[PDB]
Amino acid sequence: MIEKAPTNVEDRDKAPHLLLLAGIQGDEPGGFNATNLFLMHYSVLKGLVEVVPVLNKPSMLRNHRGLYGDMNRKFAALDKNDPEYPTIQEIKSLIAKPSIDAVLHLHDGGGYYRPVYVDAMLNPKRWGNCFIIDQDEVKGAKFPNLLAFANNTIESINAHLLHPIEEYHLKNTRTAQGDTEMQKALTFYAINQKKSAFANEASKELPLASRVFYHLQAIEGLLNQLNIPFKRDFDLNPNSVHALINDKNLWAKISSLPKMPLFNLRPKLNHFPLPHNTKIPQIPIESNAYIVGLVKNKQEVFLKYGNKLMTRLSPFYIEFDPSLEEVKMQIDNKDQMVKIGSVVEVKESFYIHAMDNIRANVIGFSVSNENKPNEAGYTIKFKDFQKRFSLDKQERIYRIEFYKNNAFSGMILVKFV
Numbered sequence: 001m002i003e004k005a006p007t008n009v010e011d012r013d014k015a016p017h018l019l020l021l022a023g024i025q026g027d028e029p030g031g032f033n034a035t036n037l038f039l040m041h042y043s044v045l046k047g048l049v050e051v052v053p054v055l056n057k058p059s060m061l062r063n064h065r066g067l068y069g070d071m072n073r074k075f076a077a078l079d080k081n082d083p084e085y086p087t088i089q090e091i092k093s094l095i096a097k098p099s100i101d102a103v104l105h106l107h108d109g110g111g112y113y114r115p116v117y118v119d120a121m122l123n124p125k126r127w128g129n130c131f132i133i134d135q136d137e138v139k140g141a142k143f144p145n146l147l148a149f150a151n152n153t154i155e156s157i158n159a160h161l162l163h164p165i166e167e168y169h170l171k172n173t174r175t176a177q178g179d180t181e182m183q184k185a186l187t188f189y190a191i192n193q194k195k196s197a198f199a200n201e202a203s204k205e206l207p208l209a210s211r212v213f214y215h216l217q218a219i220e221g222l223l224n225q226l227n228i229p230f231k232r233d234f235d236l237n238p239n240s241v242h243a244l245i246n247d248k249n250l251w252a253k254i255s256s257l258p259k260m261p262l263f264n265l266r267p268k269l270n271h272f273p274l275p276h277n278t279k280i281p282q283i284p285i286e287s288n289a290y291i292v293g294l295v296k297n298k299q300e301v302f303l304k305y306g307n308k309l310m311t312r313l314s315p316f317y318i319e320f321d322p323s324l325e326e327v328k329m330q331i332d333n334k335d336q337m338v339k340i341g342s343v344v345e346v347k348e349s350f351y352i353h354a355m356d357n358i359r360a361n362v363i364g365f366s367v368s369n370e371n372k373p374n375e376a377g378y379t380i381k382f383k384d385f386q387k388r389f390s391l392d393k394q395e396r397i398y399r400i401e402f403y404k405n406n407a408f409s410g411m412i413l414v415k416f417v
């Protein structure tokens, strides 16, 4: 769970609290791209929005609806030895917190819901582009009138339709009255804890940016009904959502390696250092986004951003010796200390000063066929690189890797600028 909170802690109790959740199915990227953009680009000014951006992260990383089955059918009876039992208990504990008032659960679904059968694409069994409640009232909730909240949220969404077919409709599943499937799902659990709970389903027939657009409209609609004041730092239209999903300023940092751009990496990165004796899901990974991770695929390690494959690492596993903190380098004539794990911009040249116990391999530069070269003490320019070794499709970013005997001492990136 990630909090979207006011800057002043005193403002937290001055408006309601929403729990916002997505990615219970790992192949529903509208939901988890919307929670990601909410976390990256919105501000909550009073009250609180608690976000679980992706509920089923292992499944997200495999672009899969659910590696362990349907996680959204595990909120009623569940065996203690279900692989997702611990995750389910964390989510139930979040939902049932006294400080939570409302829950909003995001999904992507095929076709377009209609309250009467129109055809195979548009009918009551479809889930696309609807706003869903389990029943019209939850007595004892802070906001008992789920129907009124839903209808007003639907008004807000329908004021911004991209095409008339995308019109939102209310879907009340009347779950207590015999819907056996919905009785095992998240929002019914939430109403049984006297929370006002809602689900938003964006149509899978839409492109991703348009799915995310509708999810964000639903979030904003509901926040308005709850009177949780918020801002965002962009204009809510599909172009503008697309730009933020595909933002060139997005980065990932694996272990103690430097930050790397998410987008426009080469599709494969070779001889990529990773810490040995560490399971892939335990390798630290940091990002300015909230849906990034690593997953093993045969002997490669995939860098994922939601369902997007950003690169395939061909790793070699090695001890990460953390002793080396900085390196003396000359950058464009200017001698300086550069921290291990840095990215340095280079206009013209660089030069690595020799070190007693450290060997430097500039990846893409060579002066011989030596397998473990030391390339400190060379003045290096763009023209000296074999471009195929660049990190990036643009051929501007190169790795410098440092070694102390058979251990890895760190990496610095140079970016030619």
Ligand SMILES: N[C@H](CCC[C@H](N)C(=O)O)C(=O)O
Binding pocket: 072, 105, 106, 107, 109, 127, 132, 182, 185, 186, 187, 188, 198, 199, 201
């Ligand atoms: N298409 C979704 C709708 C679930 C809606 C609501 N009951 C929730 O738990 O969010 C499903 O079949 O799981």
Ligand SMILES: [Ca+2]
Binding pocket: 040, 041, 233
């Ligand atoms: Ca922003």
Ligand SMILES: [Ca+2]
Binding pocket: 025, 028, 107, 108, 109
């Ligand atoms: Ca779903």
Ligand SMILES: [Ca+2]
Binding pocket: 361, 362, 363, 364, 365, 366, 373, 375
């Ligand atoms: Ca080299």
